[PDB]
Design a protein around this ligand. Structure first.
Ligand SMILES: [Cl-]
Ligand SMILES: [Cl-]
Ligand SMILES: [Cl-]
Ligand SMILES: [Cl-]
Ligand SMILES: [Cl-]
Lengths: 171, 171, 171, 171, 171
């Protein structure tokens, strides 16, 4: 206001839309987590994996909102749509839906970076580089690793997984 | 006697019957535990799960007996029937019998709560709320989680369980 | 006022009356305690037992007054009548008067609980369940235990008491 | 089964009967303990003495059941009869009933030892020698010491007890 | 010699034969252990299980030899036959051979106990009771537990084992 400098209306609006997308993603992971806590599903480590991602996505939204105020833009909140499913199937189904969700967030980050670069907004571009882009690359790599392991188990694959788990040193 | 106040004969008798039910349940879990210690059954974690429940059910009976004396009622003991089976089958069979047993205890708790509420006995009602009702809900949820996991193993289910156990973080 | 919600005028008034009853009980225990400190009575453990109950009853009144303000009611104080006796007799006499007093408090608590339940005031009902009803049951049980022991001493009773005290392990 | 060696059917059955006797004794001590917790009885050290014996007798039953499985026999549970009394009288009455109960357990242990010796089962005989026979001799000696002291108090006896308790060094 | 008392020539000779049997058993477990260390067998936990039993059997022989000298008998050593097999098959085969071996040791212990009892040699009988008979019962029970678990794995059995291992608390 008194502080705003080199901060376009286009970036301000796109940051508000990205907050909605991150809060939507948090809501989707809340739903995924409670589905795996059902007594007829009962996969605690899958519950915990998704409930932690709910926290991460809400914290990403909060960092964007902090940045919006640091730049002198104004936070505007919209309705948050419910998640796409009420029940999430198997661990494989859920992990495939999570990779699709993370791809969509990553594309929105890349699109906002491109808008910042077009607007000659290096603070915005560095903010996304430093706090979001590598977090998404690392998370998508982990989900792809998980998908391969789940697929080799729900199809000699059982054997190779167990050897790697129970004989070889790993984190 | 000198102390009894707002404590109906109906509640006193129903507490003595519930002590018998809890001691019966303890006896049933003692039997379940030693069956899984047989050399031809030999599932130590299943033995330990049921022997711990024997302890919990006897401690529930002792808390009811303490409360009976705190209210000025008189403990009356009856014969304790032996458990329904001498041999308990598979872990799945045993877990299904345990859920049936816990449902029966929970219904007896709910029936005693309803009698206390009809008798306008808020101490009795709070005693059951505070020390029994949530213990039963949590235990039945755990047994239902176990049942789902055993069923997915003794039927891609083997795979999904092992992934959750050996890759994902859990308690 | 700005905060009051689901808090009936009937409960508000009954809480003010119960504060008077608890402060009256505190006054009665103050008197009991100083009577047992007289040089011609001189039972220090009896003095200390009643002076501690004076503190407990004043703290009960203060918790009710805190709750009255938490709900948006208004504390109203009335005159406090002096205790029923100036001299309290023997330890047996005093313990019998204390059980009568505690019965009267317990009945007033049960009556207020019944009014809260009729008014559909679950906060009030839980407040009494959580902070008062079991405190009274435990205290009345202790006083009844003491009465039995005093009676077996001021009447083979002397023998059985001393054996339990001096040979057997107790708190 | 796969493990059973030198373990007669006669010993197996007699061990199951002795488990019933020990669980019956535990039940009797549970009843004794809660009777001395009544507000009209109110002898805490007597309550604690019997509640500890309930624990000891159930632990004896559990050690027999463990041994039954170590030898390849099969645990078989029967109905547990209620204790012989609902009310237990004075401390003297209760201690006399406890000595009768312990004599009956000791005789059953001695009878099982004799059967093991006749069957040339030295593991069984040593098991009873090492874990049961001296526990019973020591407990019966303690109960006899208590009986003499209670008798000298509920009959110069009061004097001699108090001197021993209050002047002379003892555990 | 100067010390020998109540120690029959029959017991002395039978102790020397039992030393040979224990050293033979140690040799058999040495062979079992190195077979499971072969690169074409490669079951480290099975190797370690049998190499520890080699140590236990040699220590049993040494305790018998110490006792022979404590009683004034004279240790006499004989040739030690090689183990019955050069290759030991699967873990199941090996565990079945180990139970047969332990049964044979247990029978030799029971036969020596019977000879000591016939010779009225209570030191010998207690020595075997205290240091050997329960060690054998516990080891045979463990081997029977292992056999049942191996059989349920090399035949829903895979499932029940994994649940007990990976969900339930065990030592
Ligand atoms: Cl929607
Ligand atoms: Cl029955
Ligand atoms: Cl007055
Ligand atoms: Cl009976
Ligand atoms: Cl040979």
């Amino acid at each position: 206001s008194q502080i705003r400098q080199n901060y376009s209306t286009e970036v301000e609006a796109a940051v508000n839309r990205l907050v909605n997308l991150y809060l939507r993603a948090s809501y989707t992971y809340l739903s995924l987590g409670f589905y795996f806590d059902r007594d007829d599903v009962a996969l605690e480590g899958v519950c915990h994996f998704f409930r932690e991602l709910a926290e991460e996505k809400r914290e990403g939204a909060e960092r964007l909102l902090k940045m919006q105020n640091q730049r002198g833009g104004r936070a505007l909140f919209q309705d948050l749509q419910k998640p796409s499913q009420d029940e999430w199937g198997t661990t494989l189904d859920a992990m495939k839906a999570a990779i699709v969700l993370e791809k969509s967030l990553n594309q929105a980050l890349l699109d906002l970076h491109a808008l910042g670069s077009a607007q000659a907004d290096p603070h915005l571009c560095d903010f996304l580089e430093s706090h979001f882009l590598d977090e998404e690359v690392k998370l998508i790599k982990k989900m792809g690793d998980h998908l391969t392991n789940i697929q080799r188990l729900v199809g000699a694959g059982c054997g190779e997984y167990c050897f790697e788990r129970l004989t070889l040193k790993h984190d």
